[PDB]
Every structure is written in structure tokens, then in C-alpha cells.
Amino acid sequence: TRYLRIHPQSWVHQIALRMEVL
Secondary structure (H helix, E strand, O other): OOOOOOOOOHHHHHHHHHHOOO
């Protein structure tokens, strides 16, 4: 269960997915 303080891998996906439209 990967969710400490900071989850740098999770944002990476939401970065693209925000990108995925125009």
C-alpha cells in the first residue's frame, strides 16, 4: 500500500490523463 508522505509515481499518470484531451 504505496501512500507514505510523498507518492511521486501516482501524479505521473494524472499528468498524462490531464494531457489526454487537449
